[PDB]
Write an enzyme that holds these catalytic residues in place. Structure first.
Site, PDB file in Angstrom:
ATOM      1  N   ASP A 197       0.820  -1.204   0.000  1.00 48.46           N
ATOM      2  CA  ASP A 197       0.000   0.000   0.000  1.00 48.46           C
ATOM      3  C   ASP A 197       0.869   1.277   0.000  1.00 48.46           C
ATOM      4  O   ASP A 197       2.096   1.188   0.161  1.00 48.46           O
ATOM      5  CB  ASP A 197      -0.949  -0.012   1.213  1.00 48.46           C
ATOM      6  CG  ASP A 197      -0.268  -0.124   2.554  1.00 48.46           C
ATOM      7  OD1 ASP A 197       0.629   0.690   2.827  1.00 48.46           O
ATOM      8  OD2 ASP A 197      -0.650  -1.031   3.352  1.00 48.46           O
ATOM      9  N   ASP A 199       0.901   5.063   1.942  1.00 46.68           N
ATOM     10  CA  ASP A 199       0.355   5.770   3.096  1.00 46.68           C
ATOM     11  C   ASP A 199       0.763   7.214   3.099  1.00 46.68           C
ATOM     12  O   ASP A 199       1.866   7.544   2.664  1.00 46.68           O
ATOM     13  CB  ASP A 199       0.825   5.111   4.407  1.00 46.68           C
ATOM     14  CG  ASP A 199       0.602   3.616   4.534  1.00 46.68           C
ATOM     15  OD1 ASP A 199      -0.457   3.123   4.085  1.00 46.68           O
ATOM     16  OD2 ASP A 199       1.483   2.948   5.054  1.00 46.68           O
ATOM     17  N   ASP A 272      -3.756   4.590   2.108  1.00 50.62           N
ATOM     18  CA  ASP A 272      -4.257   5.008   3.416  1.00 50.62           C
ATOM     19  C   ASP A 272      -3.935   6.455   3.648  1.00 50.62           C
ATOM     20  O   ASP A 272      -2.803   6.857   3.441  1.00 50.62           O
ATOM     21  CB  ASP A 272      -3.696   4.163   4.572  1.00 50.62           C
ATOM     22  CG  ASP A 272      -3.906   2.675   4.456  1.00 50.62           C
ATOM     23  OD1 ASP A 272      -4.986   2.258   3.973  1.00 50.62           O
ATOM     24  OD2 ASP A 272      -2.997   1.924   4.850  1.00 50.62           O
TER      25      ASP A 272
HETATM   26  N1  LIG Z   1       1.154  -2.823  13.571  1.00 49.25           N
HETATM   27  C1  LIG Z   1       1.495  -1.626  13.013  1.00 49.25           C
HETATM   28  C2  LIG Z   1       1.253  -1.437  11.612  1.00 49.25           C
HETATM   29  C3  LIG Z   1       1.607  -0.249  11.067  1.00 49.25           C
HETATM   30  N2  LIG Z   1       2.195   0.719  11.904  1.00 49.25           N
HETATM   31  C4  LIG Z   1       2.616   1.990  11.316  1.00 49.25           C
HETATM   32  C5  LIG Z   1       4.121   1.933  10.942  1.00 49.25           C
HETATM   33  C6  LIG Z   1       3.992   1.475   9.455  1.00 49.25           C
HETATM   34  C7  LIG Z   1       2.800   2.355   9.019  1.00 49.25           C
HETATM   35  C8  LIG Z   1       2.216   1.640   7.892  1.00 49.25           C
HETATM   36  O1  LIG Z   1       1.491   0.488   8.135  1.00 49.25           O
HETATM   37  P1  LIG Z   1       1.710  -0.411   6.900  1.00 49.25           P
HETATM   38  O2  LIG Z   1       1.189   0.192   5.703  1.00 49.25           O
HETATM   39  O3  LIG Z   1       1.203  -1.925   6.936  1.00 49.25           O
HETATM   40  O4  LIG Z   1       3.292  -0.400   6.837  1.00 49.25           O
HETATM   41  P2  LIG Z   1       4.335  -0.684   5.739  1.00 49.25           P
HETATM   42  O5  LIG Z   1       5.545  -0.182   6.629  1.00 49.25           O
HETATM   43  O6  LIG Z   1       4.173   0.670   4.822  1.00 49.25           O
HETATM   44  O7  LIG Z   1       4.545  -1.901   4.809  1.00 49.25           O
HETATM   45  P3  LIG Z   1       3.629  -2.199   3.564  1.00 49.25           P
HETATM   46  O8  LIG Z   1       2.670  -0.914   3.349  1.00 49.25           O
HETATM   47  O9  LIG Z   1       4.557  -2.658   2.359  1.00 49.25           O
HETATM   48  O10 LIG Z   1       2.638  -3.273   3.693  1.00 49.25           O
HETATM   49  O11 LIG Z   1       1.855   2.236  10.123  1.00 49.25           O
HETATM   50  C9  LIG Z   1       2.438   0.510  13.306  1.00 49.25           C
HETATM   51  O12 LIG Z   1       2.969   1.389  14.103  1.00 49.25           O
HETATM   52  N3  LIG Z   1       2.051  -0.662  13.794  1.00 49.25           N
HETATM   53 MG   LIG Z   2       2.329   1.108   3.732  1.00 52.80          MG
HETATM   54 MG   LIG Z   3      -0.923   1.202   4.769  1.00 50.47          MG
END
Ligand SMILES: Nc1ccn([C@H]2CC[C@@H](COP(=O)(O)OP(=O)(O)OP(=O)(O)O)O2)c(=O)n1
Ligand SMILES: [Mg+2]
Ligand SMILES: [Mg+2]
Ligand code: NA
Length: 348
Positions: A197, A199, A272
């Site tokens: 995704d 963000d 997001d």
């Molecule tokens: N359990 C989590 C999940 C997410 N986050 C925060 C840090 C990452 C940010 C983004 O969530 P994701 O989109 O799933 O993270 P990602 O680092 O961008 O990895 P990807 O988007 O490739 O799935 O939100 C957090 O503190 N705790």
């Molecule tokens: Mg992400």
């Molecule tokens: Mg995300």
DNA sequence: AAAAA
DNA sequence: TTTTTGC
DNA sequence: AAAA
């Protein structure tokens, strides 16, 4: 000579992983424990994987593991096994487990987490084709979008696609809040080439309480009118100024091929958006940059080492009985007594 | 499962 | 030993 | 309850 901390927030973790043989195995074992609802064993394998990712060299003998924290007896047995034959028998057994294979396959669908994957497994389902064609099953709106745009969402997102999405977000946001600051967060801010995704953190120094509340609704209605909004779920803020999350939305956007500077002529992209008050922008940026492991160790360090309470909205000092303010991430690190870790060094 | 209390 | 592990 |  280098005394490695047990905390990811006291380590520099870049994307050049010299120990992928070990961490891919540890990531699989952690994932299995997550599925088996063994939270403790899951976290122990995630911490071991995290620390190996921070090393500036590959482990080639058991002597190389001396002084490294989060590597207990069970983890050292796994490392020993991989040094022996280049393979993990433990991770290989998980990859051949029917429950594990089903959980990976089912949760690969947007809208399907641990509970729904477990439900489908206990019903005897093993393939996505059998799930989708079943006439008795009821799917959430999230899952319907997850199945409809499955191939696009599973192929992930690259840097040209992320940049194309950033342009769309910024163009839409400045239309309603011209002085708004839009920052790409998540994996892409940490220097990743791909992601599941894209963000974004949105903040405005002059917007009112009402303007701040309406932005995500205005931006998504604009995209809905264009026929670009494939999925939308807006979560109103549960943030309390004196005390749970900022106003956010989980979207699927239609990304036209012409917008990407790198078939059907478009790709479904998970996006997001997070809107926060201007004075909390550093806490939100820090929280949303990640990684997950870096955030959880930041919070754990704050609690256990500094008697502080950290979250995406604030930092509270329990001894001084004061909330600590910050205009930048650097100020948050300084309040915690931590050396500043750059975003590309937070890939724990 | 590993480390602290 | 029990408790904590983002919480 | 569940997905983020
Ligand atoms: N359990 C989590 C999940 C997410 N986050 C925060 C840090 C990452 C940010 C983004 O969530 P994701 O989109 O799933 O993270 P990602 O680092 O961008 O990895 P990807 O988007 O490739 O799935 O939100 C957090 O503190 N705790
Ligand atoms: Mg992400
Ligand atoms: Mg995300
Ligand atoms: Na999912």
């Amino acid at each position: 000579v280098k005394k490695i901390s047990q905390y990811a927030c006291q380590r520099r973790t870049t994307l050049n992983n010299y120990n992928q043989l070990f961490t891919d195995a540890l990531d699989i074992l952690a994932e299995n424990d997550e599925l088996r609802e063994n939270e403790g064993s899951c976290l122990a394998f995630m911490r071991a994987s995290s620390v190996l990712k921070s090393l500036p060299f590959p482990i080639t003998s058991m002597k190389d593991t001396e002084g490294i924290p989060c590597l207990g007896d069970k983890v050292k047995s796994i490392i020993e096994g991989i040094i022996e034959d280049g393979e993990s028998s433990e991770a290989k057994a998980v990859l051949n487990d029917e429950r594990y294979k089903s959980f990976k396959l089912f949760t690969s669908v947007f809208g399907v987490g641990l509970k729904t994957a477990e439900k489908w497994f206990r019903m005897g389902f093993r393939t996505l084709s059998k799930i989708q064609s079943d006439k008795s099953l009821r799917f959430t709106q999230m899952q319907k979008a997850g199945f409809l745009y499955y191939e696009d969402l599973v192929s992930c997102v690259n840097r040209p696609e992320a940049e194309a999405v950033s342009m769309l977000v910024k163009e839409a946001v400045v239309t309603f809040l011209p002085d708004a600051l839009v920052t790409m967060t998540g994996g892409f801010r940490r220097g990743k080439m791909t992601g599941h995704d894209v963000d974004f953190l949105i903040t405005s120094p002059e917007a009112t309480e009402d303007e701040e509340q309406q932005l995500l609704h205005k931006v998504t209605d604009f995209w809905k009118q264009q026929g670009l909004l494939l999925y939308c779920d807006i979560l109103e803020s549960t943030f309390e100024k004196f005390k749970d999350h900022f106003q956010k939305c989980a979207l699927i956007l239609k990304l036209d091929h012409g917008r990407v500077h790198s078939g059907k002529g478009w790709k479904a992209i998970r996006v997001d958006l997070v809107m926060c008050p201007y004075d909390r922008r550093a806490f939100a940026l820090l929280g949303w940059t990640g990684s997950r492991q870096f955030e959880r160790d930041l919070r754990r360090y704050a609690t256990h080492e500094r008697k502080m309470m950290l979250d995406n909205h604030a930092l509270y000092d329990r001894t001084k009985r004061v909330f600590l303010e910050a205009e930048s991430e650097e100020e948050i690190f300084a309040h915690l007594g931590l050396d500043y870790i750059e975003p590309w060094e937070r890939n724990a």
